[PDB]
Symmetry: C2
Amino acid sequence: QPVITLWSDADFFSPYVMSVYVALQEKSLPFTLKTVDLNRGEHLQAGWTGYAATRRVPLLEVDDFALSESSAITEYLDERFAPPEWERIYPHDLQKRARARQIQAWLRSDLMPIREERSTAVVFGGAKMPDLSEAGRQSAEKLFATATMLLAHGGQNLFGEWSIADADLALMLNRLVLNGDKVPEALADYASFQWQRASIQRYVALSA
Amino acid sequence: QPVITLWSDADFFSPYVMSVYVALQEKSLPFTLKTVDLNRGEHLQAGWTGYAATRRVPLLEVDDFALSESSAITEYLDERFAPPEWERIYPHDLQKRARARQIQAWLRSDLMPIREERSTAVVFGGAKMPDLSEAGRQSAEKLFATATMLLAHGGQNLFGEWSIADADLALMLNRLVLNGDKVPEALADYASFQWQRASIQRYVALSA
Ligand SMILES: N[C@@H](CCC(=O)N[C@@H](CS)C(=O)NCC(=O)O)C(=O)O
Ligand SMILES: N[C@@H](CCC(=O)N[C@@H](CS)C(=O)NCC(=O)O)C(=O)O
Ligand SMILES: [Cl-]
Ligand SMILES: [Cl-]
């Protein structure tokens, strides 16, 4: 049994920490949760292991191996703790897996106005934010249109069975849904359904 | 033989298009190169296949499958056109592969001041940019420190044999090197060595 440690921000607000946390829970992997206070710059001092990685959370330690970047981490988890012995968190189908990777990489590198104007303080901290800027509206429209195309098959999950991409997409949608913003009904249904995920709800409880 | 199409920005300046182009070349996969003019918004009209993906380049088509996000694309290529028949572009070792993914995901989601103040017009277009802002200096220092740790083994490539992460890291470093900025000598040596890669030089020739 490897010793697994997950490093979180001190508020448990990070969507990227959430992604890793969810992956661990879905595989029933035992782990220790530790924190760094980003607001006080605990990440920008060399006392924590993550200063030597990318100086960001999440960081996952598995025995003597330390790895940053949530998607790198979850991909590693799915390879190291592989099906059938552990539950798979990426689609088995080549193309669906590629689409899952597309979604993850897209969410991490686009939609900055939503990430800034609808931070995870809305999602995990009960914060309420003012109307979106026009830049925010543009990002919202792209999000909506993209999610609608991905979910056009009418299924509950992106790729049939639940995958880690569902958690990440649901979080992004919930930045808007949980702020009380106007969201297409089918997308609000998806986001609220996915947010009930036991693994997600366990993470939600951390910042309660 | 699948029909492969790569969509680029019209200038061939995208670092993400470069990553895919390089992957294709390294595997000796035949493909057609097409362009959309981002400056004129050709990506924000529904006449191109990529409006229905994430409305960004690169987009790769492989017969009837269309996929965006450079790292999703290169990961797909390494699975669909797998070693030994085709050259591998990700490390075979589990941990080195995870580190390669970390680097790719990190470069795509951090260092925004470098990406903005040292755009790929410097890299591919002969542009020269003024002194970095303090925010730019902060990003440069993080880049330097991180690359130095990754390359501390003293080898020519990140993970022994060349991997796609070398191309992406070299490009990021070359945003600074090719602008005439002060860069630690060992990192400038790495960046210039990697930039000689035949696949990279072929892409460089496109915007000549
Ligand atoms: N692409 C990343 C992003 C990680 C990230 O942005 N983490 C933030 C907290 S949510 C952070 O550590 N920021 C501190 C900093 O950039 O100095 C991932 O998926 O892990
Ligand atoms: N994470 C992406 C980023 C892709 C990206 O930012 N592409 C830019 C050109 S370099 C783009 O298409 N921008 C158009 C837009 O955002 O509307 C990747 O690796 O493919
Ligand atoms: Cl914090
Ligand atoms: Cl263009």
